[PDB]
Design a protein around this ligand. Structure first.
Ligand SMILES: Nc1ccn([C@@H]2O[C@H](COP(=O)(O)OP(=O)(O)O)[C@@H](O)[C@H]2O)c(=O)n1
Ligand SMILES: Nc1ccn([C@@H]2O[C@H](COP(=O)(O)OP(=O)(O)O)[C@@H](O)[C@H]2O)c(=O)n1
Ligand SMILES: Nc1ccn([C@@H]2O[C@H](COP(=O)(O)OP(=O)(O)O)[C@@H](O)[C@H]2O)c(=O)n1
Ligand SMILES: Nc1ccn([C@@H]2O[C@H](COP(=O)(O)OP(=O)(O)O)[C@@H](O)[C@H]2O)c(=O)n1
Ligand SMILES: Nc1ccn([C@@H]2O[C@H](COP(=O)(O)OP(=O)(O)O)[C@@H](O)[C@H]2O)c(=O)n1
Ligand SMILES: Nc1ccn([C@@H]2O[C@H](COP(=O)(O)OP(=O)(O)O)[C@@H](O)[C@H]2O)c(=O)n1
Ligand SMILES: [Mg+2]
Ligand SMILES: [Mg+2]
Ligand SMILES: [Mg+2]
Ligand SMILES: [Mg+2]
Lengths: 151, 152, 151, 153, 153, 152
């Protein structure tokens, strides 16, 4: 089924929010299939944020995403992409609603805790998952509790 | 004797370990439990609970779901209680329920959507569902003292 | 398998701790098979606390257990009786360790939140479950997640 | 920012044991406590705090409530705090507040709505409410080192 | 009881955003907040607070720490509070504290052990520490109505 | 470069939705994550991880369990970290683990006991298990700034 790249940004890691974020996505019933603590180098960052290469915030973006380790993940479940952006709330954490990840934990745009593939960008999920993870690092399993999450 | 609403952790809620989490949002919200029963819904009881959907495609699978494992059936009392419960639960379809609600936090399905609560917008749905699942000998008439601090 | 009678006392109910207690016992992997919000009358109380009928605290005990509603339960799982008294902690909540129900939520002996059949009293569990619940009120089901809780 | 706002757990939040949850909420949001006092509010102080309401029918009910038990008074600081805190609280009427907010998880009353927070849409309310509850000697000037991860600048 | 104890989130607990968790812990235990102040501790006050330690080798490191950032000072009241609070905290050395206690869930240092609480085994420590941090005008006398369910008498 | 311990949410931890809850107790405790990998353990890898129990009755069922679903494999850094982790996890047999520990709170079995962490009392178990499950290219050398407030 549908998967999406999700990553806890260096602010999240530094602020010790990996658990809380993982718990939010497990508790929503979703299935972790890839998971990796790693540091993003500047060539990986440049390739990740490519779409923003002309923007005035780019150099600060790569600077930040490269400023400490992240926890990179793939998640699978029904409608996962969009479900995950709903959990995360709005991109600017100062605008995110309470009960979402950024509404609860951030109030900044740059240091906004987390990233999730944009479902409105068709193919963003598969392209980012293939950026961060090799097929060898992604795990096919059956989460048994899926029989009670879904009809 | 204030406003009561019927509320049900569905078999998926029970399977996934979520009874206490749901109960905790109801009491934390300040609502009072007056009935509470762990039970299996038999097929007649579900025909009656879901009589209004008998014509609809999803009916058969709805009756099979709601009888496919035990439920936790509840009655909850408090000011504007039906509607407060519908807001805590969020959208019937959990893929659209807002994060912070019970379905936005815990579910990713419309059939397997954790819980039921009476629809305040269907007039007398509460009184009827309560009366369907509970005898008046299993509702409990009590005063929750912290009520004195929940309301003015 | 083994079941045990567990009940949230009127202090627990009044203090809005039913959820938290239920969650603790579901999260430990145990299976709810009976569950009932009810009031204990004085004949049920007298029969429940019979063993304490001579003690100086009896009349205060029945008075309290009868002072508001309780939430009466049966729980099943491996070694359930003893596992549950371990969750509850010590009878006097002022002596219970932090991380147990009474260590976290009480500090009184009388108003000590909760009751669980005493595993050291052989047959206490079956005798109390049959006191509070008829066989019609207890549910036989398969909690699927039991396949991951137990070998 | 040096942006500060005044925040108060009201006598109901205090009585229901929710001082800690409200504080975790604000801390977890990355906001910096700079003032904080457990205290009783008396007649004069409530009449001034609420005086914008002196001509209103719920006024006497309100001074009676806000004076019926202790409150936890506070000041918090951070980017857009006054506004962020207001969003965290939810609608003034808890029965209208969205689940996820303080009021939507914990209240369903208008009078007993847990909590108060300076109105960002009333210019000066924050600095006025703070100077009401706190002398400048009771506010702390410090650096929450985690701020460098909450914010980029 | 009128049994009160002095409790302090230390500068590490304050910086790590744990004021709220510690307060929820105490509230949830059914204990009554009667005093509470966010504040900075200076030289004189620490030298007196800790003076039983004036002759010890960790003393200078300790005044430096307890003075390196703000603390949340408190007073709590209830049955056997001083002792209950001490058990809630766990061993003074967090790396020795049992999981379930404040120190065992959140610390693993001796210097930076989150929190302080009057020693019930030192007679007078509670009433002495409280009078140290609080004037009697800053303590509140009230009735937590839930107390009637926490206790039978 | 301080003390590191290897820690593993076992397949049951992963199935039951407990990865984040465990990770949250490790970070809340102040320990630093330096490695972290969601993976399936193959049979050779489990022969090596459990070589010391190869003679024992429970070995075969142990290798079948630990390969029966994916795991979350971690490395954790901090003062006295091996032993701090063994205390957070509590007794190997979860029916005896104390409430407050990860096993006392979440488990009721000895085989299905949620997590593994290196035994501080077996000298060099940490360095060896870490080296077994992680290449040195997947350990991350970083400074967690709130360390400045966790320790003196
Ligand atoms: N003015 C801006 C815009 C975006 N950004 C950051 O760059 C990231 C990617 O931007 P984006 O438009 O793809 O937003 P999302 O897909 O993450 O919602 C955001 O998450 C922001 O953190 C920023 O720092 N400043
Ligand atoms: N296509 C549909 C529509 C509803 N249903 C289920 O049947 C239930 C009752 O539908 P309903 O519109 O009366 O919803 P509620 O009153 O529970 O909000 C829902 O909770 C859905 O779980 C379904 O399974 N499939
Ligand atoms: N001195 C005492 C002893 C017991 N009790 C209460 O009576 C209950 C039953 O006593 P018990 O000796 O069977 O203790 P448990 O089986 O509940 O551990 C306890 O839970 C106490 O609440 C009391 O109020 N005062
Ligand atoms: N009709 C009303 C309106 C407000 N109030 C109370 O009075 C307070 C102050 O009114 P307000 O419009 O300034 O509300 P906020 O500034 O707290 O959002 C509220 O928090 C309500 O508790 C009331 O009791 N009845
Ligand atoms: N060897 C030691 C002993 C204590 N201390 C610190 O000094 C404080 C006071 O010592 P204490 O024996 O009165 O400890 P408590 O009364 O807080 O249990 C402790 O909380 C430790 O933080 C230290 O830094 N080094
Ligand atoms: N009879 C036994 C004993 C141990 N074991 C399992 O094998 C694991 C390793 O045993 P161990 O004594 O080396 O324990 P730890 O180093 O993980 O504390 C345990 O975590 C138990 O789950 C078992 O399945 N059956
Ligand atoms: Mg984009
Ligand atoms: Mg309907
Ligand atoms: Mg007994
Ligand atoms: Mg071993």
């Amino acid at each position: 089924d549908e998967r999406t790249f999700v990553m806890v940004k260096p602010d999240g890691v530094q602020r010790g929010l990996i658990g809380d974020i993982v718990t939010r996505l497990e508790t929503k019933g979703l299935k972790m299939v890839g998971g990796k603590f790693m540091r993003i180098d500047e060539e990986l960052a440049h390739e990740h944020y490519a779409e923003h290469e002309d923007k005035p915030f780019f150099d600060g973006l790569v600077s930040f995403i490269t400023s400490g380790p992240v926890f990179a993940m793939v998640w699978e479940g029904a409608d996962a992409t969009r479900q995950v952006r709903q959990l995360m709330g709005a991109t600017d954490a100062q605008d995110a609603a309470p009960g979402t990840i950024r509404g609860d934990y951030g109030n900044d745009l740059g240091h906004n805790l987390i990233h999730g593939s944009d479902h409105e960008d068709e193919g963003a999920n598969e392209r980012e998952i293939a950026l961060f993870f090799d097929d060898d690092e992604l795990v096919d399993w059956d989460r048994d509790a899926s029989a009670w999450v879904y009809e």
